[PDB]
Amino acid sequence: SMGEIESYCNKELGPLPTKAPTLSKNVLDLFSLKGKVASVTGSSGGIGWAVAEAYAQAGADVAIWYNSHPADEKAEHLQKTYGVHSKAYKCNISDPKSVEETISQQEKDFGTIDVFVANAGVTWTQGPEIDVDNYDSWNKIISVDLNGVYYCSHNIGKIFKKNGKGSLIITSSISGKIVNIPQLQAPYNTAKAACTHLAKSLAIEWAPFARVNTISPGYIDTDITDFASKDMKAKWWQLTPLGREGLTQELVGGYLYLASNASTFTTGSDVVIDGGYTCP
Amino acid sequence: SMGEIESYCNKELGPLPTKAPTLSKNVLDLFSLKGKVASVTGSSGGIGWAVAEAYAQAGADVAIWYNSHPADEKAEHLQKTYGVRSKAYKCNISDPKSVEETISQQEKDFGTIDVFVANAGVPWTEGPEINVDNYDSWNKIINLDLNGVYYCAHTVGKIFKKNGKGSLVITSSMSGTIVNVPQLQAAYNAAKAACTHLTKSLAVEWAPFARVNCVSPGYIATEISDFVEKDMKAKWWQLTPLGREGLAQELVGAYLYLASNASTYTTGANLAVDGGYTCP
Amino acid sequence: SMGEIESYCNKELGPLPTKAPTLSKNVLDLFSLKGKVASVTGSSGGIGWAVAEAYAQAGADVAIWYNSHPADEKAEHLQKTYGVHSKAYKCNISDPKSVEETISQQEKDFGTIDVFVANAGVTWTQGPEIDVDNYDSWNKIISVDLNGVYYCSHNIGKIFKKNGKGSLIITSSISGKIVNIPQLQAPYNTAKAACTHLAKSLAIEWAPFARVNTISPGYIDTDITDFASKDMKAKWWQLTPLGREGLTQELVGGYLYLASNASTFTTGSDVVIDGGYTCP
Amino acid sequence: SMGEIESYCNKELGPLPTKAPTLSKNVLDLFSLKGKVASVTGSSGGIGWAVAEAYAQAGADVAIWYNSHPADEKAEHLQKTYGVRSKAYKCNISDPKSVEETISQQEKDFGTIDVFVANAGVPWTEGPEINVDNYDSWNKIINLDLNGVYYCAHTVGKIFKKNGKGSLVITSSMSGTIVNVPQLQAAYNAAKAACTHLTKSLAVEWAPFARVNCVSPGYIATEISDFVEKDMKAKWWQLTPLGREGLAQELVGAYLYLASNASTYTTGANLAVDGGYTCP
Numbered sequence A, C: 001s002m003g004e005i006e007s008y009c010n011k012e013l014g015p016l017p018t019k020a021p022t023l024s025k026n027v028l029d030l031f032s033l034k035g036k037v038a039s040v041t042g043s044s045g046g047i048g049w050a051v052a053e054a055y056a057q058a059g060a061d062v063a064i065w066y067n068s069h070p071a072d073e074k075a076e077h078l079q080k081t082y083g084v085h086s087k088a089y090k091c092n093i094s095d096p097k098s099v100e101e102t103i104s105q106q107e108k109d110f111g112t113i114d115v116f117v118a119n120a121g122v123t124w125t126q127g128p129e130i131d132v133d134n135y136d137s138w139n140k141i142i143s144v145d146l147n148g149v150y151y152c153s154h155n156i157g158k159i160f161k162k163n164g165k166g167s168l169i170i171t172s173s174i175s176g177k178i179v180n181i182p183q184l185q186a187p188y189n190t191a192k193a194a195c196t197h198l199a200k201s202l203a204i205e206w207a208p209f210a211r212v213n214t215i216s217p218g219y220i221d222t223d224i225t226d227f228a229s230k231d232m233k234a235k236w237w238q239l240t241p242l243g244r245e246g247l248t249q250e251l252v253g254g255y256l257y258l259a260s261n262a263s264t265f266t267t268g269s270d271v272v273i274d275g276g277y278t279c280p
Numbered sequence B, D: 001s002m003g004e005i006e007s008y009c010n011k012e013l014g015p016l017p018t019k020a021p022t023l024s025k026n027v028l029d030l031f032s033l034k035g036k037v038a039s040v041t042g043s044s045g046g047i048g049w050a051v052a053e054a055y056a057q058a059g060a061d062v063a064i065w066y067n068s069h070p071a072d073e074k075a076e077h078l079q080k081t082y083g084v085r086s087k088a089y090k091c092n093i094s095d096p097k098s099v100e101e102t103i104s105q106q107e108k109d110f111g112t113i114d115v116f117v118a119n120a121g122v123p124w125t126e127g128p129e130i131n132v133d134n135y136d137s138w139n140k141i142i143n144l145d146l147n148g149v150y151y152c153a154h155t156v157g158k159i160f161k162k163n164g165k166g167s168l169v170i171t172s173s174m175s176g177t178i179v180n181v182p183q184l185q186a187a188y189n190a191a192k193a194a195c196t197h198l199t200k201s202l203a204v205e206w207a208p209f210a211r212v213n214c215v216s217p218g219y220i221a222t223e224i225s226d227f228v229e230k231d232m233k234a235k236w237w238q239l240t241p242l243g244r245e246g247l248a249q250e251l252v253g254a255y256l257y258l259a260s261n262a263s264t265y266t267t268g269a270n271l272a273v274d275g276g277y278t279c280p
């Protein structure tokens, strides 16, 4: 160790400074995913499908994930429309063996995984915690939205380390930074705050072989928010600086930014796409 | 509800504005805890014992909690030295049924609970997650440092709501806001970030009847974190603006601040006591 | 330098670790300001007078500051009521020579300054910036609320360094963390965010001889908010988890905490007293 | 206003909800800037030139700004290489009258301004503030790094509001969120924190007609910060999770993200590009 500058963050970086990637001098080339394999969980759903389709547009092979809604037709659509390889996989991400077995099969079928989006999740819809005496629903949120995200990260991390490269994006939420109102949802906020800081912690630990970042969406027009009445949505609009909910298409730019070589010095960051909601 | 100003945060506040409490004319009397009962989990250990003793000095009856290290002589020390009432209770906070019984008994023994400090926890010590394939380590952290905190909160909140008053303090960590180095501990950091934001979420939901805040200590010279290696501690000191670890006696003022009527407008706050560590 | 652990933050700490203060084992004694001199700017106003009176209650000599409203009668009241030394000083804090001359005279009249509260400030009341084409009002906010705070800090810092001890508290605002609505006040928010990060920066630089912290109040019932109509206050209440504005008396506990030996490991922190406003 | 949902943030949004834009079907086309005019201050220097060239690659007409280092050959390089239109402008951004004239001329020369990057700035280099008694250093930082940014924003916002569209990007710094060490620079950190929160405040006020975001770079290998000392840089590397400084080419993707229609729901956001530095 004499004769080396040793990192205070992660000695597995080796003697410092590490060396910067060789990048195209053209900014547009940086956003390409040509020759790359992406795996997007929760990709039978709103945000996941938008991101998955966009990764296919950028040139990537895409592994689609679903649980209770088969998305084989979505994978088939990606191959016929963009000519990339795509397949759909059924997995309950609360089951850690099933996560391990799904990702291991994806690595076999696609050869590798370059980009991973840990996106599947469920909401809390039962109002204030004080009145839910039964711990099933807390356990459901923690299992899927926190433990399941860690199962995906821990297994994909081993592939990134073997190959020496990778980009992990975790879908967090503004709920990891603020407390949603008027719908009270403490267990979901707790899990998403944990997701956001897990991303920062893994960014440190994986730095020799991968980048880890989060997207924190605001209110996005998907079916996840269909439990909400008109008067509750109206209050969301009143508190959003842009004055509306976002579209799933307004998120894909950030997911592509983080997945691609546009962001090779970006790690441990939280990219907020929320119409300004976290500012007031 | 015509004519009432209804909260966007919590309609159980009633028609706004809510009304402020009467408070002592003298600032020093605001910190008094006589007439109050406090319950401090993990008060076998370093921080918990310091807080428990400080609360007795302020005049509170204090319920001591332990798991593997019986603390009855601690409770009887509080009895003897300060003339308050005190009893020690054995509880595994990862078991929700035992948490409920312990809280229920304390309410029976002391009459009520005014102040609750959710402080018990364990560290992660196994280095980088990517080399730990038993999820048992991950599960143990989450079940004690996150689930167990939620079990305590869910039960004590019902007492606060019955009585219409209460202060809940959660011991989080600087690890919920930053990523510790060089000792990598992503599971612990994730759990503590969850605790910090659970605090903020419960502050909104419980606002009609209680305040909820957290203390985020830095490196504190308890027995646990003093068997780590010279070279590790030295790096912590180099990155701490005050240049040293903290004493447990440097935490008790923040815990008394949040427990007492000195902080009646303070809720959802995170008090960092870390020698400046989160600043660089 | 061989044979020393050198700080990465501030080599003027000397060889590490620095040594912890010897504190009373009784938590109540930690909050005393007996034998200490405090200087509170803006102390003809609401928050400043409450803090000043409270510091006198805790045992401190108090230097009162005013600009357009003489507060000699307030200083006289402190001496007749609590028996401490107190005098009032007229200073326009936008004037850096006047700041220097006031603090230098206070050090002569009182012997030293142990605690300094940089609290004087003015609000922006002119609505959205886009319609204020004239830069007077931006310049007014920056001069008083930012430059004036630095003039006080820079001059008091020299006294703390000479004596090797001190505590600086800056009154910031939730406006340094969030964007107030519906009253649009970008220049004030900008200055208060600067105040909050100046506190963290000075905490690093002054660490060998002083602590620096901020209080960030929410909406407090003083005359600073009298420009606001009932329908605007009502929206503030709707967005505040506690459902009301705070009282000045609800801030003094935090100002005493930071001023006293209750907080000797607390530096660079921002203590938010806002009824939970920053949580949603 | 009966029957309308009125914003709590900004009533000039009109009756809510506001309406979303039509966007390209293909994610890659979202990043296009053809048909757009961009104005990039400080584009003599490292970061500004990189951004200006990246915007021309994306198809934008680009206005170059300089002060002491004429950049007409830079603008003519953009002319020659990309076929866009480009001109360089000499302006001292600490002088508000010259900022207004420069912005006015650019509007006349190019027809409009769609994208504005407020990027010009200077560092603090004089070590700890407490030893610097000329406020000239403090004043120079504030006047260029804060006041000058506000002058650019105030003027360009009127163009955006006239046209009903626009994207403003402010170059802040990791220094607005953390305190750099070992080089102490409180004045600069304070100014950059002000820029970050000015961004957030202007995002709310301008929301009916523009987005406002900031990029917060870490240590970037520009000429300015490469003449610092070996031992200083080595400490930066040791505390950076990626183990190195960033290249200016690692920033341009974030600037293009925020400038383009890839980020139409992104406002008030701070994109950290710092190799993970703010995480430990």
Ligand SMILES: NC(=O)C1=CN([C@@H]2O[C@H](COP(=O)(O)OP(=O)(O)OC[C@H]3O[C@@H](n4cnc5c(N)ncnc54)[C@H](OP(=O)(O)O)[C@@H]3O)[C@@H](O)[C@H]2O)C=CC1
Pocket: A041, A042, A043, A044, A045, A046, A047, A048, A065, A066, A067, A068, A069, A070, A091, A092, A093, A094, A119, A120, A121, A122, A123, A144, A171, A172, A173, A174, A216, A217, A218, A219, A220, A221, A222, A223, A224, A225
């Ligand atoms: N939409 C919004 O407003 C925002 C959403 N988010 C987060 O975005 C993520 C996706 O949300 P969104 O697209 O909006 O909602 P959707 O319900 O449309 O997507 C949910 C996806 O999660 C999958 N999934 C759900 N449960 C499981 C489970 N046990 N095991 C494996 N997969 C499961 C679903 O699969 P299947 O249907 O096949 O069962 C589905 O593909 C979530 O993490 C959400 O918390 C955060 C900010 C705002």
Ligand SMILES: NC(=O)C1=CN([C@@H]2O[C@H](COP(=O)(O)OP(=O)(O)OC[C@H]3O[C@@H](n4cnc5c(N)ncnc54)[C@H](OP(=O)(O)O)[C@@H]3O)[C@@H](O)[C@H]2O)C=CC1
Pocket: B041, B042, B043, B044, B045, B046, B047, B048, B065, B066, B067, B068, B069, B070, B091, B092, B093, B094, B119, B120, B121, B122, B123, B144, B171, B172, B173, B174, B216, B217, B218, B219, B220, B221, B222, B223, B224, B225
């Ligand atoms: N020391 C430090 O530097 C810092 C500590 N913290 C947090 O402060 C809290 C206490 O830490 P500290 O005092 O330093 O450490 P200690 O090990 O001294 O205290 C641990 C306490 O937790 C109790 N406890 C442990 N496991 C369980 C369990 N299953 N069920 C119920 N109770 C349990 C222990 O009880 P018993 O011994 O009887 O088994 C003990 O009272 C923790 O939450 C820690 O994460 C946060 C920032 C820094």
Ligand SMILES: NC(=O)C1=CN([C@@H]2O[C@H](COP(=O)(O)OP(=O)(O)OC[C@H]3O[C@@H](n4cnc5c(N)ncnc54)[C@H](OP(=O)(O)O)[C@@H]3O)[C@@H](O)[C@H]2O)C=CC1
Pocket: C041, C042, C043, C044, C045, C046, C047, C048, C065, C066, C067, C068, C069, C070, C091, C092, C093, C094, C119, C120, C121, C122, C123, C144, C171, C172, C173, C174, C216, C217, C218, C219, C220, C221, C222, C223, C224, C225
């Ligand atoms: N009240 C609130 O809701 C909150 C206030 N704050 C901040 O609290 C601080 C005090 O505010 P508050 O007590 O509520 O309002 P007040 O108007 O009651 O107090 C203002 C004080 O500032 C002094 N002052 C004003 N201008 C100058 C000037 N050029 N030079 C020297 N002194 C000056 C005034 O002196 P004089 O009257 O003698 O001229 C007065 O003592 C301020 O920094 C405010 O920004 C932040 C969060 C919320």
Ligand SMILES: NC(=O)C1=CN([C@@H]2O[C@H](COP(=O)(O)OP(=O)(O)OC[C@H]3O[C@@H](n4cnc5c(N)ncnc54)[C@H](OP(=O)(O)O)[C@@H]3O)[C@@H](O)[C@H]2O)C=CC1
Pocket: D041, D042, D043, D044, D045, D046, D047, D048, D065, D066, D067, D068, D069, D070, D091, D092, D093, D094, D119, D120, D121, D122, D123, D144, D171, D172, D173, D174, D216, D217, D218, D219, D220, D221, D222, D223, D224, D225
């Ligand atoms: N380099 C880094 O690591 C980081 C830089 N930043 C910020 O990025 C911005 C540019 O930095 P960088 O490119 O690295 O530094 P450079 O010194 O290379 O760029 C400085 C630019 O500012 C312009 N400028 C300087 N002073 C004035 C002035 N009074 N009036 C008008 N224009 C002026 C200069 O113009 P001219 O040369 O023609 O006089 C130059 O174009 C700055 O805001 C910096 O604070 C933030 C994080 C890290």
